[PDB]
């Protein structure tokens with residue numbers, strides 16, 4: 001827990017290793033203090049996969065959902081705590097839910113307005129992808145290549161390109177582990 005914990009998953013150091021879908025889910029969680037079912041699962045299970053303990057997860061999710069009076073701790077405990085515990089098996093269900101790979105994520109129903117699950121390389125506009133990638137210090141040429149992949153429907157290749165351009169068999173947790181190790 002000294003490395004991956006409820007507080008460190010909000011740090012720049014750890015979050016620099018997230019792929020765009022996880023970055024998007026964290027941003028929606030930060031802005032809205034809530035995520036709908038599909039994004040709640042995609043993000044909760046990705047964090048379980050990178051080693052966030054069950055105890056630190058309940059800290060992370062309860063703090064994020066109750067921020068700025070968005071809901072009382074009571075409402076969190078009555079309406080969400082069970083669902084988050086179930087993702088770790090804490091309520092006695094003997095299923096160890098596995099993190100979603102890219103194919104699984106792309107296969108979920110496409111996000112609509114207010115949703116943050118899915119794959120930004122498919123689900124975002126070029127304008128929104130361009131700005132996000134500019135903010136990650138990518139150049140014009142580099143962004144055009146990434147978008148070429150997006151236009152061909154080759155989302156996991158576009159993601160791989162972004163990994164390659166931001167560092168000096170398709171799975172968000174694999175992106176995280178590969179990026180974290182280059183960070184060490």
Ligand code: SF4
Nearest residue numbers: 019021102119159172
């Ligand atoms: S390709 Fe996979 S890891 Fe990359 S942004 Fe899309 S769903 Fe996430």
